[PDB]
Amino acid sequence: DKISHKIDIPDSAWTIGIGEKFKNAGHPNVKYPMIDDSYVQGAPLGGFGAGTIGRTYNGGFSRWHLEIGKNKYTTVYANQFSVFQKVEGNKDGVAQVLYAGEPENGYLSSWKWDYPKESGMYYALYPNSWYTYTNKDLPVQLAVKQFSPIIPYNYKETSYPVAVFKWTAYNPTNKNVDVSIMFTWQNMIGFFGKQVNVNSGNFNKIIKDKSKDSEIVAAVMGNISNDNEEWNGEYSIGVKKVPGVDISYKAKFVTTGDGSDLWHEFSKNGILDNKDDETPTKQDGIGSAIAVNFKLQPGQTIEVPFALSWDLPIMKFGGGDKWYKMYTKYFGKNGKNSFAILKEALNNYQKWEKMIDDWQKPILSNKSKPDWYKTALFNELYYLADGGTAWENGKVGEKDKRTNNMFGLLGCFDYNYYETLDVRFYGSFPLVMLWPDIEKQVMRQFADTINVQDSSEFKVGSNGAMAVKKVQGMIPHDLGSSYALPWIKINAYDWQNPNIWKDLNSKYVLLVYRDYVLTGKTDKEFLKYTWKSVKTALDKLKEMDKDNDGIPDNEGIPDQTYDTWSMKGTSAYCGSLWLAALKAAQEIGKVLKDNEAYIKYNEWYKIAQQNFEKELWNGEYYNFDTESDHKDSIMADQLAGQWYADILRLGDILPKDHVQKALKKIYEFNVMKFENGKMGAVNGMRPDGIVDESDIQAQEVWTGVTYALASFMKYRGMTEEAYNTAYGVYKMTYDKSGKGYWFRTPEAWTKDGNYRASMYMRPLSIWSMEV
Numbered sequence: 001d002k003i004s005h006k007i008d009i010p011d012s013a014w015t016i017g018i019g020e021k022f023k024n025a026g027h028p029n030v031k032y033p034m035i036d037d038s039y040v041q042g043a044p045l046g047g048f049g050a051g052t053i054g055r056t057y058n059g060g061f062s063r064w065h066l067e068i069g070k071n072k073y074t075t076v077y078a079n080q081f082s083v084f085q086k087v088e089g090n091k092d093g094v095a096q097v098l099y100a101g102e103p104e105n106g107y108l109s110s111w112k113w114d115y116p117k118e119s120g121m122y123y124a125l126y127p128n129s130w131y132t133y134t135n136k137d138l139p140v141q142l143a144v145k146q147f148s149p150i151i152p153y154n155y156k157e158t159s160y161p162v163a164v165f166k167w168t169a170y171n172p173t174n175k176n177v178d179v180s181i182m183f184t185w186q187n188m189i190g191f192f193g194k195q196v197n198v199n200s201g202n203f204n205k206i207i208k209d210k211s212k213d214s215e216i217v218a219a220v221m222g223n224i225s226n227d228n229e230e231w232n233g234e235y236s237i238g239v240k241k242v243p244g245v246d247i248s249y250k251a252k253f254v255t256t257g258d259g260s261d262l263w264h265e266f267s268k269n270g271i272l273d274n275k276d277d278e279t280p281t282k283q284d285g286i287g288s289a290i291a292v293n294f295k296l297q298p299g300q301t302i303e304v305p306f307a308l309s310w311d312l313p314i315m316k317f318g319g320g321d322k323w324y325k326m327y328t329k330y331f332g333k334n335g336k337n338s339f340a341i342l343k344e345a346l347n348n349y350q351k352w353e354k355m356i357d358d359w360q361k362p363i364l365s366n367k368s369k370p371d372w373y374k375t376a377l378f379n380e381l382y383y384l385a386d387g388g389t390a391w392e393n394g395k396v397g398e399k400d401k402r403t404n405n406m407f408g409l410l411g412c413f414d415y416n417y418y419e420t421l422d423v424r425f426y427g428s429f430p431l432v433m434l435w436p437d438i439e440k441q442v443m444r445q446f447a448d449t450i451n452v453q454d455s456s457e458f459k460v461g462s463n464g465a466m467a468v469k470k471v472q473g474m475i476p477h478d479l480g481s482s483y484a485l486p487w488i489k490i491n492a493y494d495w496q497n498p499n500i501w502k503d504l505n506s507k508y509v510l511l512v513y514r515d516y517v518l519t520g521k522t523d524k525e526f527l528k529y530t531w532k533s534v535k536t537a538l539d540k541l542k543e544m545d546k547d548n549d550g551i552p553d554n555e556g557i558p559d560q561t562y563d564t565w566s567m568k569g570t571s572a573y574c575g576s577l578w579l580a581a582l583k584a585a586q587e588i589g590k591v592l593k594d595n596e597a598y599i600k601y602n603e604w605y606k607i608a609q610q611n612f613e614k615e616l617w618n619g620e621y622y623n624f625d626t627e628s629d630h631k632d633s634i635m636a637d638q639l640a641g642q643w644y645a646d647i648l649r650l651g652d653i654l655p656k657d658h659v660q661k662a663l664k665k666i667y668e669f670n671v672m673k674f675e676n677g678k679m680g681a682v683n684g685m686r687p688d689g690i691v692d693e694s695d696i697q698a699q700e701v702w703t704g705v706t707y708a709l710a711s712f713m714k715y716r717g718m719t720e721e722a723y724n725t726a727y728g729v730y731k732m733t734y735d736k737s738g739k740g741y742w743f744r745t746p747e748a749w750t751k752d753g754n755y756r757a758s759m760y761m762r763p764l765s766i767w768s769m770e771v
């Protein structure tokens with residue numbers, strides 16, 4: 001490895017060998033069908049709301065999130081980088097696809113597949129990833145840095161459907177070597193969203209854009225139709241000329257063929273035919289190729305940038321609504337703008353790299369934090385782009401343009417609900433901290449739903465009872481499903497009835513006040529906007545107190561985020577959330593000078609606090625609840641309200657001494673007596689130190705609950721416990737001794753390491769550790 005020295009990969013990047021097999025991968029632990037795409041994954045490319053593309057550590061473009069809200073894992077084999085190398089004075093060169101694998105059928109059989117093992121490495125520190133190629137048969141060593149411009153406090157470039165591939169080539173040998181790097185891409189119009197005639201009308205054109213000191217050559221892969229539909233638009237790949245490289249191209253090769261139309265050119269001398277051909281295809285798949293060729297002298301280094309863009313302006317959901325994606329604000333809505341996007345990337349990628357470095361450097365340069373923590377902190381952010389992220393710039397056919405751009409991030413793909421609020425309580429830390437204008441827009445979207453009534457009915461999955469879809473004054477579970485109508489039909493979730501949940505209204509209030517505090521305690525307008533909904537939310541939750549202790553009663557069913565685990569009476573979890581929400585509402589009361597609300601919630605608070613303490617404090621920790629069979633279970637998340645109170649600077653809702661004892665107990669039991677403290681915090685443990693078997697969820701570690709708990713321990717000075725707790729989640733996700741969940745962190749695992757719900761929003765809570 002002579003190439004690593006020539007580039008700058010951070011030590012905290014996650015690493016794996018190109019072509020590495022992983023032996024101990026986990027699988028779903030439920031009996032119903034559940035996504036399991038394998039451990040062959042990588043950091044995604046693409047902006048927020050753009051559709052994302054998962055290029056894996058093996059090199060393949062395989063995890064397709066271009067259909068917003070869907071996850072489609074299939075390798076499009078034509079999509080590759082390939083290399084040609086010939087030593088000066090040799091008869092022939094070698095040509096190799098940089099993909100550790102091969103097609104399943106006979107298409108592209110002429111290409112050289114199966115990039116060998118132990119010949120290069122993949123590195124990721126989101127939004128960057130790298131590959132290095134260190135192959136005994138490639139005398140010139142190569143590396144690529146690939147990224148999209150995902151940049152905190154930037155809502156523009158962060159939306160772009162673009163990726164940059166910055167290549168570095170270095171010749172450590174004593175002879176001149178001729179080198180070519182070729183990008184191939186299938187015209188993927190019709191890959192989704194098109195019913196019939198799926199390749200028909202696809203065509204490819206070549207753009208050559210020359211100004212002084214800027215030459216760009218690109219392929220634009222579109223369709224002859226000018227229809228404005230979800231399926232139609234353009235892909236582009238291209239390259240920017242640098243000194244000492246020549247560009248060649250091929251407009252049209254057949255992907256549903258042996259590939260020799262392209263490969264017979266590339267494998268001769270690494271130079272393509274420069275043959276333009278806009279002839280549209282009918283049945284056959286087609287693709288384009290862009291190549292650079294250069295001679296490297298001994299000791300010489302060369303850098304060349306490629307890019308990929310995709311202008312697919314319309315997203316369609318299952319309920320029938322069609323929306324424009326966010327980036328259309330910057331480039332247009334007609335689906336004929338892929339070249340503009342690509343050019344902007346090729347001309348500005350160096351600025352974008354520095355903007356990324358500028359936001360990563362304060363964390364990376366902090367020598368008090370271990371590398372593993374930096375690995376997790378940055379790489380968990382993959383989900384912001386990969387979580388089916390929807391970001392609208394108008395409804396298709398909309399008359400009056402609106403001021404705001406609605407946003408949604410999925411809870412996950414198996415439970416396909418937008419902004420699942422009981423989950424976003426944990427998972428939304430990166431948005432409030434790094435993209436606060438998005439965070440505030442989402443919370444306003446929730447404010448707007450408080451008094452919505454929808455008397456249409458649904459069957460509650462867990463019991464078979466019919467229930468009302470949306471009750472006035474109850475915050476919704478979610479803002480819809482990508483299978484139905486995001487932002488329009490709320491409460492797509494139906495396993496339980498969210499209108500009787502005891503955590504949603506509380507969590508909503510805590511999120512509102514969190515978003516004011518963590519953006520500098522200045523946004524009174526935001527508190528103004530949300531105030532009526534906050535009062536309504538708390539007032540409705542108060543009505544669910546049935547024995548007048550001042551606290552909502554859990555109803556002996558799962559009526560909160562732990563939606564198969566029954567709570568009954570006053571629970572530590574919903575009880576502490578209630579207390580904190582009440583105290584947050586007092587403070588909003590003072591800021592907005594609503595002394596009536598202040599007095600009201602202050603008296604509710606003092607009564608509930610006294611009773612919470614009496615009912616649940618047992619001398620060592622807070623009991624699970626007052627009325628369940630396993631009421632004395634030690635719950636990892638028992639003091640979630642106080643966790644948030646620390647972040648919101650609300651002081652102590654429970655006594656310092658009791659919180660410390662409770663946290664030490666949780667570490668001693670839920671962490672250290674669960675698989676020797678190496679897998680996070682199990683949710684429920686019996687006081688005899690055996691895991692609570694009342695429900696599956698009690699026997700699960702929740703990744704986002706565990707990272708949040710680590711945050712809580714950290715604010716309370718339990719530094720070792722905090723990082724030891726979080727480390728188990730890191731280890732299971734990323735480490736060789738884990739279960740292979742990189743770039744698909746799940747909700748949960750059980751003691752055997754098998755998982756539930758990969759690609760999950762909750763573990764974004766790791767960012768609470770940076771408050």
Ligand SMILES: OC[C@H]1O[C@@H](O[C@H]2[C@H](O)[C@@H](O)[C@H](O[C@H]3[C@H](O)[C@@H](O)[C@H](O[C@H]4[C@H](O)[C@@H](O)[C@H](O)O[C@@H]4CO)O[C@@H]3CO)O[C@@H]2CO)[C@H](O)[C@@H](O)[C@@H]1O
Pocket residue numbers: 031032415494495563564
């Ligand atoms: O929806 C999000 C929610 O999901 C919870 O998980 C649920 C699944 O969503 C649901 O599909 C699953 O349904 C099971 C059910 O539990 C079983 O009891 C049932 O068993 C059948 C059996 O297969 C039949 O042979 C027999 O005729 O009837 C029995 C009884 O109905 O099978 C269905 C379908 O697989 O239940 C899951 C929970 O156990 C998550 O737990 C939750 O966290 C999510 O929010």
Ligand SMILES: [Ca+2]
Pocket residue numbers: 544545546547548549550551552553569570
């Ligand atoms: Ca009560």
